[model samples]
Target: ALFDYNATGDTEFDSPAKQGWMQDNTNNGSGVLTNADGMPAWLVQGIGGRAQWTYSLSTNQHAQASSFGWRMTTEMKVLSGGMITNYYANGTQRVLPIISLDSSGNLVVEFEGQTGRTVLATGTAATEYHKFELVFLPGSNPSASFYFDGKLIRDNIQPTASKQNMIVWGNGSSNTDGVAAYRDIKFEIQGDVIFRGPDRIPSIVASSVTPGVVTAFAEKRVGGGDPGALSNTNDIITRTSRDGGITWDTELNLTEQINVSDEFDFSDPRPIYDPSSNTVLVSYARWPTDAAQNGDRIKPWMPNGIFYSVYDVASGNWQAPIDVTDQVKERSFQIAGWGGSELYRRNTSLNSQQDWQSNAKIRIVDGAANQIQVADGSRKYVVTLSIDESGGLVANLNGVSAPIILQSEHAKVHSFHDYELQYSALNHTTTLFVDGQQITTWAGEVSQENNIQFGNADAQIDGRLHVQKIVLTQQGHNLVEFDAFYLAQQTPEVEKDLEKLGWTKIKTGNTMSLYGNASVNPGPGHGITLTRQQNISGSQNGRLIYPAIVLDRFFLNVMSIYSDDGGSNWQTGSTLPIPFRWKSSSILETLEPSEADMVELQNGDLLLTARLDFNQIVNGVNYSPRQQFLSKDGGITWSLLEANNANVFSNISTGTVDASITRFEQSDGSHFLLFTNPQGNPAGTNGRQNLGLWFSFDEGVTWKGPIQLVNGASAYSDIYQLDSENAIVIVETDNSNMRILRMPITLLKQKLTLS
Candidate 1:
């Protein structure tokens, strides 16, 4: 029910049920005043009483447990002068006011009046008579409903207590003179309402009946044929799951025809499913053509834009391909589908001053090539878009565009550190949830401002313009949260290791081992301290370093150990190849061994673990965060294991930052990994001293203890495992005098259990 003030300048009501107000003055400064008796009321100083009316709830006999609220749909002719105020009372008088127009030009209800005002319904310009329903929950606060031209806008629980007496007034109270009118005001009170829970029912169901496993078959170094040859690779084979992982139809060979001379490499692959068209989209990185021109020594350059390929499962063919990279070069792209279009954006870059640049591109595309661009600069930009019924795009850009739809700027920093976009056409609006809380929304019609061409290139509609890598989900929207602290640093020494183990260095021309001594020297005092014994297989004759084992492919999972007690005891474990790339730890009973037998777990499973120090440096200055990988079925499959908040810098030191983890199995048949993390200054200069230890149980599912082992040592520490029972732990001063202690594993376990 919409009331077009344009058609009728004024509307009069005869019902005495409640109170209402109206104004003809554009600024709401002057208007005829009518009280509950339909007579002229006191016109307080300014336009206070003009364009104002009130009804006494006292005369109508308010019912117990009856909650009531009103909805006004009006367009603000002027920005500053218009205001809508709701006056209510319990024991104290309070006023709630809402300002702003809906996406359709009609003003919607604003919840800023109270801490927990619920939006019941909204009225649109198309339909004026928007019905608002209220239900008093006896003991609970009242609930409100919003309806737009007969359709429900929202049915939410009120955040405040229901008032017995209420009156709503609208007028231009400020300086800007503007006329505001509303019509089709209807209200209803229900005895009881059963709120519906989250709508989990899928309107269109998609299921993966036969999920197939992902395998890591073969890896080869292309381009210069080595890691250091160039910072990038020409081509890499990336796999895809069309039927929700039911079947893998071979690697797409993303760079099959791509020129290798350009120093191009492929990384970051995000796969998504479009339910509207049942198409599978894979977005990935393609080194820009200007890579060789960049002065950086690394072979492949940083990503420029996102590239996508659509796979039509019905025909088993992919579209010609499109480049969606527009505006600035974006590295981490996230995509979500709404209506029938795909929307995307990337992380902002830091400026010359090292401050975060608040700008992002909003790319919208339908199945066809028609794309729309919305640029947000200076202001914090987190754009989320979804398609509507007409295949049009609807977006929510934080702090940039809105009815103030959704926002998280008020949330704690780390609590909602990242913002993501999610949409559902069923609700007819784009919902923006930051961290996990919904902030703002945008209806279908209001598209953001035009694209701002800040970079060198002019904005174009080429299907080839890809911006961000997007992963798709069959049902709900896809989400990717950003952590500034975690991804702040670049990976260390990866390029150097790749160069030493180039294709030319393989023992056999046909096979290569991923874990082996690099042909390149470590430089200066840094040398191969913990070298492993080598084993020969196939036609290879030379001795390989570490727990050496010949593998069919260049990629192998390996582990190494270093002892501070001299290089004599340093050892490197044998290398093994896992058939699958992303494997979980629980399923370790399936791998088949190729050589050398070892005792298996009681369940016939094999558990393998890898450990690294937090401060371990490859070249010298750069720090490499420790990573853990687990393999169960022998070495057929592997999974990257992440300890709860466990990574490089799990603990920090004021003077010397050092951390290490060692594996141990307890008598209770539970495996525990112990970690030594220094939390305070090692020198004890400030008397702030603490030595912490962390233990994990249930086969790494969770971890708990970090009890202090010792304190008061000015400068100290060296840790080593002796057998499985007794171990050596030491703390020392820089003067060379050491405080070493040998403690039994049983005693340590007892202390941890208590903690």
Candidate 2:
């Protein structure tokens, strides 16, 4: 198990429960707060009382009886004095064993049981933050040890009572406005977990030639927390598995092998295996890591030769790193952290007069110091949620300042193992759910002056407390929480991958729904064609890539959507082609698709040609071809077509080259069907999936002329029937989205005007 909580915001490792967060106030948190280090952190503060974050996962961590062990590392800052932690164990939370600060600005920890709680020691220094770690030795009455900054702070610890069941830890004052914040949080099972990253980009690759061998590479920012420290970051590492990804060898730190300058970072790893040579090849782009050289500027050059390196199996060693990009940048290294709703905000002044906080319905986006102004100032004032004393409600409009009406009971059934604390405030009522279970609620009038902002006052940790990339409800409202972390999946969702691949030509292609069929009324009968969809982040050819040469390590399923008359738009409940979800550890070599062509068979049947680039060989396949489908009543439905009575497919051209098909009509009303694509036999690897114009006469009972419209790095193409004598071919270029070529279908009357 692996998790990275060092993300940009307050969130968890692995997957976070929907509506997850922690805070002392009743209304979760106004928003995510930052640490003194400029990294994401969570906070719990109040007026007279105090607020803290409690993350509880209900699963019995000591379920193995003889094996009850766990480990956790947390970062904390003690601003105000008093209790900071709540002890966790058994079937429920235990009291004591809490950590806090003294009136003299010193750190303190506790050990608790039924009799009484014991004080461990008082910290000797005045500090802004403390890195704490707790480790348990597996056994009955497990022996435990605790440390701060690697210094053994406590020992000789044992169970207050038996039966260990749950584990939970949090920061903030139990009493007093003891402000606390935490981030870069991580958890483990007695050292049995891998820490992915708080900030890292990883890639996965499978050996096409080897069966059980798979490798994963990623980046790790040297030091875990405290980015201000001179930590060696942006370094890369590789992990290999001989058992098909089920088990991995200890990571191979490539930074020690390749990275020379600590100032420049390397990324976009393209790791591939050559079954023939029995070697693994790895390559990545390098850029200046200095803060001055930020973003796209990190990599400003095409880079000289030697960006490539080979890992030899026989010697069990990696060869020296080499750079051989030939200038083609490998933009395939992908890293996606997570996604979330904008829960809370600190130091704000946005009023209920308008915008986010003021609406009559769905009021989220909390405030720190400001109170939910119920009946004051402009009549525009209806509600305010930025007030805190003993506790607070994620204030709602109609804005009444009522004492906390809340979920004060813990039925405990819908518990907290790997979870979140979400409060939904609707129509004056606020309901709190513990991982989707309605744990509690409250209703009141809400109003804010938009003038009262949150800042370093009233025991609040001095910093710009804010939340970004939190959670968005299905209805589209942003929810904020204090000192809470969340979970996000997959790097870069599919919508954006296609948006850029389809942008320059189409408008709404930027945001798309990945699941379900969509629209048509959108027909293929057009005079102009486009061959410009491409995944620029990966290989320019439109397929996804990892780092670069390691391109195609992970692939996306292509859809062959179509339209009869073209206008219904797209998604959610239509009959568009179903896409493939292939982000799995296993990979099979076969795929294709794009455009379609319609033709009239000698019979009263309407034949539609959809592109399928499935190239399979031996135990795998990969051949891009235009497969035929017979649509009886004008394309409402279609099925695999076998023979055309004329045995056309058994008679004419067939192969794995994506081609466009359309019927041509002469002045005499007699015509044949046309096909275009890169000419390849479609059955063998040597039958390169390159671009070329191939056609068949006799209604497709026979064919000829790959009239090779293009002879370069081409992948897919489309054709439009302009007139009986002229046609336009739109095909992908070696290094471009598309190149237009106009040609005459009039054969050896071959006046092949440059297309």
Candidate 3:
């Protein structure tokens, strides 16, 4: 027996800590060792309290456990809140019983796996203590059985492989926030568990060979959270497959040699094979650590933009990286800002807002202090404006350790005033201005902290502080600009003006304003070089274009950047028409209608497929976030696609996620478009599952063949046609590995005919 614990006597399980169990209370809740039914037990109280044990399941770490199998049994009761047991294999979440109580007093157990949740059993009273057992059998087909009170709940369930192991009960990291009690636990190697690795988002591009050489690029996450999660370190890795994608070369990290001061995460690798240049230009986005998402800030001088590298087929080497941020990205001044609600309530952390005595009166732009700003004592700007406790206006500009505080001469309370606190990093000066008049100046070394709070005075003698206008700027770039009075009116005209200004009105209950620099993100797929079509003018032959998304704090615009001079220079095109509107001012604005992929059609018209903004209603109609647009003249201007079939892309079933589309042509002068994405049937969030293929003939007037390529968990994929009858696709499988599939067009056609 590997482990055993009996709770029949108090002395047997008096101290949980002494018995090697670790306690966690991120919410600072409770965990008490008490008696249940005259037996020693552990009571986990509150939503955050939990007890866990860490172990290793690798053959290298546990030779005996690898040779034998494993089993675990425990008795527990869902007393108050819900009860759950989270099992982790390596760092990946392993499926297990997520226990809870129904309104009818019945116990509910679910398997919350990588895909989603699946109900296992219910009907037993949750308040009653019951024996739960999990038995594992190891072999060629390793599987496990779950039993509740000696009755089989689930059997023949194959658990994931386990390299590292951990088990936590009672309100773990999941939303199963609740209280519970556990006793008489037993775990033996004879009942075991699962394992997995990191996420990989792939991009593929085919060379201009007879049976084109397929080169696959994937942003493989090393220690990131999950696929599509931000701020995690990801490396751009590549694999080249010869002989029609049947086999590939070893993986190579293209960004491994680059050196810089700040750690940057690279993602959304869009590779375009410029046959004329005999090179593959891989364009991707660079996210400074912690600044990987929209509304996330990086150090003023850091690289939070778009970058690319050239892969020379002749030299078999990836050249140095190049920055194209200034060419394609938008500076803050390029976008407009407008009105928003006044000092509203924010869910501020108790740790940072310790001085917060009231919620409704506080307005904050957290700026994600630790993640978004330069915390390394670098040269950067700081803006501060506030109403002091003395009823006079005061500004605490720059460095908290040695701040330059400015006090106004008069007690300015009741009315609106324009106060600007600016800090010059180069001169190390903090300057104050009131109503365009320079008030005072101080010289000091200014540090960086992103938190910007208003009306947070120590003394609240004034009924309430009123802020008519607030503006935060960096250098000359306005990061956040708001006029509360304009928004407070809540008029239809005001709303229309807000939308036109691109101001993401902070919802009624939200306190955080839009605050961050804009970013340029290339699609996670291949770009196209125009060669066909004779109708459009700017759709010049040989012009290279990559679909891209220009994003800021609250809005995203899908467009394309093209190169007329063989990549020596690039130009940005006008954005596609944004039909999104405020979805009732309750939900956070949609983050979609971006992350686009483009395919030049037979008629020279560019077809763009994008992840629709899930949060925004589409042209006043609610639909899936799988939408298409048509660019008649290359990618200059776009219009919503009005396909004849009316059901174009109707197969897409889940949340907005990156997908791919490519053209496959035959000698008969006929071609078909192949699109790949998650087929969110058996639905889950974003349903990152059932990675499948859809075929579109007739220049994308309609689609066919949801020929499922992957059955279970999958995401972000890119396809490249190899020859007339063959193609290659790189898929993110189970969010763990990047798999390159060599597909046969003839076989797919046969299946489509059968369907």
Candidate 4:
């Protein structure tokens, strides 16, 4: 390893403490000068002292050369001959191998007592900085090779001993001008030279998600004081991201931030965002400032108090210099995209307790009945203002004065004032902004409001800060007139936002023919699996299972890709289609099932259906069935059910194949089974053509609904219901097209209908 302060300015062992390399002139070092190679290196001019350092490489791999390999390189120049190390194993002199310069200035390799040495008097210019190296074997009586700058100058030298600690800038017992200069030293043991392999890889993921942001925290991998378990120096770092996780801010050094001290230690800090105030609060255990740095090393218990700190992000600033220690004994604490603050609506409907929990911080003081009490559960009661009773601009929280720097305040009072404040909150810190310009911020977790009466009661506030509007929003939003309010109100109608997406009634998309289709998407692996679902794991109260198809040369490997948080984020599981059935389903003209379908069997078992691409013309004019499977492990694992299920249809080529299944209590109350697919004795045609739906009343043993939805050029189709009364069917035609047709339970009840 290379060291710092090398080849820099030489203050000549400035402090007497370090040069002991007679001395540890630690605070200083020998001066530096250009070596023979013209690069500056430490030039040690001894005054009877050896300024040297040694390091240990104790891993088992380091002791045995056969298991891996061992090598060391040191560049140096000597008034005499240069660099050698003390052969050590646990502080005992165990001579494995050694390389050094002899009195004659020749490169030499020695063992046990320098016997049978390959001591060739190899040398370099007395002042030239030369790269010297030693290489060896683990076995006894082994020969060690010595090299100078990559070339072997000595070989087949014996090592009568064991692996030992390495050294550089060592002492020479000569009375000559034996001064030594050195730099650029490296040691690689256990296959760690030039290139190496590694063990298992560890993965990191978000550990907590909430309050509109996701935070991931992990123990610091480096820099912990504990060479032992749960060391005092362990650290905690945090990262946040959102949406696609493409960007993330730098890590938050919570551990360092907690102690902010020289020697105190702490870890596992959990940061909480006061929902109402939009600030951040964190809790951590810390050692007392006056406590000894290694106090825990002697004590049975580590630091025993949990302290909290708050950060206000509104006007952009909580100090609950809280020692929740007694309350929470030293217990540990708990998206890159959701890294920053987002705009959420303030209390637009003022002071209501619809979804609120509080101590009612704001009293309905005087004529301030309209002044809204905003509480997000993170911080205390919050309020804002424009013109006040004293005719001054004002703002406050829980009755305490709040800071505000107004670029403009909408004037009213004809008691005229409408105040809109935008706030960013987290970890107990809230930053306030006006018009887009930052104004002020505050700290402190909301103290569950005050013991005072809420909106109905009154405070002694003599101010008439007439307010027509006040909001501090985050979601679905309220207002941010910090920019508009000072500009006042023009009172206009609340209009609608944007316009509706346009779509005209259309018919069909794509057509694929099995076997006869020379243009089939091909896969060398010869196994293709396709799956599609609707509201699989979402807020959709009425869920639907559907079918989908695909044709691609590139392999797509993934399963269960679903989203629930408004599709803002999505994740996928690596589970594959029932492994046993990957290539067993026969309808695939080019590969395995391309589009898959599912339905609950008559026995109430979740059943999966796969389309067969070829139509085996039966007897005279009939055909066989498609493939099917069953799932029991909540969609994670599937096993073969039926290669040909009688419920859907048979003889239909799986090419134009597609079906949708959903379990729902019908509008009429009782439950019924639903499955859709193509129908024909020699059913199926073009890319997902001729789609039909089947109704199962007794859970599949009985069925109905030849309810045909598409008849031409169909390649694939799926059905989903918005409600018991409304359903939409999507199907494909050969032009590689598709259409969304509404399926009214009314029309569906009428028997046959074609779109």
Candidate 5:
């Protein structure tokens, strides 16, 4: 018996109401104590009644299809009339009958849709117990095997239906009435269940140096504080791809020597490809057993050491990691943040840049040879403006006096000049600029809006406005730049045409912070080799650079580490100056800067993008925005690359997580930058998900098209350009496995009409 039902005394199957099987019985049918052959047996009695035990498989632990099988064995004796049957898969009822008793005291078996019942060995004794077993294999042509008294009775009997999650042994139909005794019943499922694996794989780094060859690495976390249990161990595993990421080799442990356990384990794996040396250098942090840097403690600082290993392409071997903490890190700084540095190849000579999330900017160039009428609005007239009959720009600023006129000296009926109207919702003010000079200012509300319109003036106002071009910017980064030549050929649908110009509205769902209790592991991504420095600052041909994070008490910031002679020696650059914070206080007004990725631009300027967490509320608003910086000197000093105080991409939400960037220069002389991260739109109250790719045409100043790749359960991704036309991305999917996806340059630009 699978479960002991000692109801009279020490009951094993107690509380029939709670038992999934006993509570589902009909016609008062129940299992009672009986002595069939001087031994305890479960006697089932009923008059046209039945009892079934349901065992639903767990979706997380089982594969419903494939070469899966099941077996049911029990010792039974039929007194008057009864049958052994079960409900099969796909809603077929009472379709599987493996055993039955005939009126001639014969042992018989019949399957669903069978022409006749097959007689096993003739049993003239209905009062004696016999061993019966049924083995079922579920698939396209399902078959079953039966055995009686340890002897094979039938082999390969086709069943009309597949296996189900339930079993039954009692009265088979309403006309049937009989008593049956069963004991030593055992049910076995051959293959279907499995244990759920790691809680998350926070980082997946892909690097390529050799032609048509790529290597992918991951920091697989078994336990974590986010859910389930705290992280007990982590491992660094890698796989190789040949033929430009079309296929890959099996996974191999890159850090096999590092014993992973509750006491010791690894966190991040950042790999960089060196074309000059034909090697891939991997850098990560070591978490030692100490009071300072333990994974669980919530202290402001933790202890960690920077370590690295080199993988030689010729030998296919990884050198022992060498500790470089003393050479590059300060003694006072304990723990830093996560790292997402991407690799830069020397020969490719491509520029990589990232977009800092915020409000977008707009620009218009018009040929004002004649008088032009204008009206612009965004959802509401809170920040609306129009050119009146007197040519005065009238503005209706929310929360302030309506229709404030900006009659500047340069404002004429017809002239070639620039006009700019800016609004800051946080500051509650609107400013108009004419010819690079502030013309007027008004205090008002400019809440977030999704849609906007131009030339909405009535027929009374002339609609002969000559617009040469319209451009859009976010945080000073250009996202849309379109010339009005298309308007001459066809009347463009403003909204659809804007989308064709790579303008996508913000869509926010839910938001969450997953790395609150995560451990410190630097460079979850790879580094870059500076080849453009030869033209800009006259540096070594293959100088390598990777982003580094150092924490000091309540302060954490990002820096750079460089190696002039390949990976032989290293130098640490200056830490970035904190740009936003409280004047004088231990608590920070903004989150610490951490986990950064860098790329060298066409003019040899290195651009770094780092992750930022949500800060404590100060001015009735909280902030969690991505930060950008530019380094002209070879990884020595840095300066801020500014952004507006807006929310995430395409929507007004907050999401600051580790992201990756890569530069791809097309054969047609068009340089494009690619970035990947969990798009925060519609992710306001949800965990980091929706892994997407954003494209930029004119360096990293402007961005567009997330090209949403994965829409659920994704975080910490790294991208590497494989060749001129292809690239590969390694992202943590379902927060469990490191997934590799191939992206083609032509496919990414399919939506954009590049001139």
Candidate 6:
């Protein structure tokens, strides 16, 4: 029967108190209450020795059901001391059943036919709402299980057999004196659930990207001084990155080797990634023995030969190191490009033995393991070496290579010549050129390649080889030249001895000039300037003095004058100034005699500028104020164009000099000047002594305000025009901090235009 309890009579079991079960209570407390949504609802409770609820199954015939599932939700906070249970009906006799709480404050489900009930699962501190499920599977001996929060909680088998019917709120009590609020209960037939699988990957697309240009500089510290504390004592290392900074192939160490530590104290760190040869060259000063044992024998830290190591990127390993330092014995050697293909190493040697004789050496090495020696044996001799792209070594000697070139009487006289050699076969031909004229040719065929070994017939010469200039031809030839000289009287003996043999005097010009002053006894001052006709252009006439300026195609010379008697003994100044001015901008346009000058482009024209101070005056007169000037045509003409006029007269009487220009360049096609200004702007106080920068756009016609690059310190600052848009300024602070600044070139141009 469909028990429509809402239509039944006297739904309230208890009168006045209005508690217990009845028809209206069966459905929303005797139909007086509504569902949560204000609709008629069903309610069940313990009634007439059984907890019963309305049930209906649309089946014509009775069917034995084994299990039943239900959906239920709770709005109740089931405290620790609470239990919930459900009872169902069998076919005939009514059975009383109960599910109780375990010692663990958990729900244990039991039935009349179940002998034991197992704790399925326990509840958590879900103080709010939760959902649960319960299933009763009827068997030979009935069993029941409960689910709490979608988890299986209890399972048990009943010993006694009985028919099963839907039951609600069977036999349980709230020990905590709380109410069990259950709602939305629905029943369903049994069924199974399913699952799913994994995921997949898609095809990838590829591309390439170029990296940015990266520049890194390293400095080394000597002694016990920490590089972190003192950067000045550190040696600077330079490396360049090409291929858009993908790799740096060239590594250069500018610091000479010094044994800072008494032990094995060599830190020959180089650039990070060298891709060219995949190798880094590192050299450091090392003591042969412990510092304590040989402290007195320990020499001052000097440059040592560089060590070579290859980094294998593919295997991620570094190969064993190899010593590449054999050319120069000392560590303070410089590695420079020789010709085009080989590297030349040069180093100065000290007279450690106190023999009063010292010389520098130029060791040449080619890519193919060939070694050549070019030694500067005499004080007046100089040597240069280079290698061309074709791997040919070029050595230049400025002084004679043997004592045999001078007769005994003329042994004091020195001879200079340039020799060029290209060795390939066993026999190598050398061409000698004295001054600018061809002199002699010699062919030396050797069993082994020429080297610095003594007594080898083809070892070039055992004596010192003086060299002036060495050039590697684009076609891979060594071009070397120097000057030679001999005493006049000794020339006769030398020529006579050489004539007795097959030798002949190919070139002769004039006798050597007298070069001393005679002093008589307290009478007349005696000085003689003897003149002799000498070959001014012939190979053997006059001695060749190495020109101060050397250019591939330019013919420029300079002459300098000095005063002896406090400006009384004045010599004639040279007609032309030196073509090159080291670190001076004035040398760019015209040959000016000012230091710290540069030539740069402004408004698409070359302009010369210099930084000068009032205190640099020699004769009590400030020849040029601390200012900047411009020259239009090289450096022939000059005009006062731009001036750093701030704080000028502030310290004029205090002998304060304001100008010390360090570098100038064209950045972003605009002119930029970096200098040091002792007297800062606004005039007083510490004068803002710092490194300043000025920019110009209209050439040197005008300039902007001096912007302080580094404030409150002094340093050696240098600036380079990196590109059209950028400039790199490096400032070495007093604390040895190397700070680099990069700025847009347009900023200078704009400021100059506005100013």
Best by lDDT: 3
lDDT tens per residue, model 5, 142-242: 56666666555565566554434444554545445556665555554332111112533333333444577777676545454221123445556666655
Cα deviation of 599 in candidate 2 (Å)? Answer: 73
Q: What's each prediction's TM-score?
A: 0.21, 0.25, 0.50, 0.24, 0.47, 0.27
Best by TM-score: 3
What is candidate 4's CA lDDT for residue 547?
25
Q: Global CA lDDT of candidate 1, please?
A: 0.31
In candidate 4, which residue ranges exceed 4 Å CA deviation?
1-5, 12-38, 43-73, 78-83, 86-90, 93-106, 111-127, 132-168, 174-179, 184-755
What lDDT is reached at residue 508 by model 1?
Answer: 11
Candidate lDDT (C-alpha), each: 0.31, 0.37, 0.57, 0.36, 0.51, 0.29
lDDT of 4: 0.36
Residue 622, model 5, lDDT: 49
Q: Which ten residues in a row have the lowest lDDT in candidate 2?
A: 515-524
Tens digits of per-residue lDDT for model 4, 39-138: 6566655434334455544445344333223445567665544333423332333334444556677655555555555553455653456666655433
Order the candidates by TM-score, highest first. 3, 5, 6, 2, 4, 1
CA lDDT of 423 in candidate 6?
23
For 1-755, candidate 3 gives per-residue lDDT tens digits of 34444444456547556666666665456677776556777776656434344434453323333323345677877775454673434243244666766666567676543343334344555577888776554333445566677556665565654434554455664344676777866665421111123745678887773244667787757675532334456767787765556456787777756534437777778888887776788888877656655453442234567878888776667788888877775432111211122322122122221111111111211111110111113333333444444324344545554333343332122123455555554545545565566866654233443333443222112112334454544434544554543343333344424435543323222222332234677867889777874677635787889888766455666877888777767767656654433346644443367778889988888888877654545444554576788887677667776432114655565666788899998767778898988767553245787676889877787788676665555677788887765677667654356655555554344444421
Q: Which ten residues in a row have the lowest lDDT in candidate 3?
A: 365-374
Model 1 CA deviation exceeding 4 Å by range: 1-624, 633-638, 642-660, 663-671, 682-690, 712-726, 730-739, 752-755
Ten contiguous residues minimizing lDDT sum, candidate 6: 517-526
| Model 6 lDDT, full chain set | 0.29
lDDT ranking of the models: 3, 5, 2, 4, 1, 6
Worst 10 residues of 1 by lDDT: 518-527
Tell me the lDDT of candidate 5: 0.51
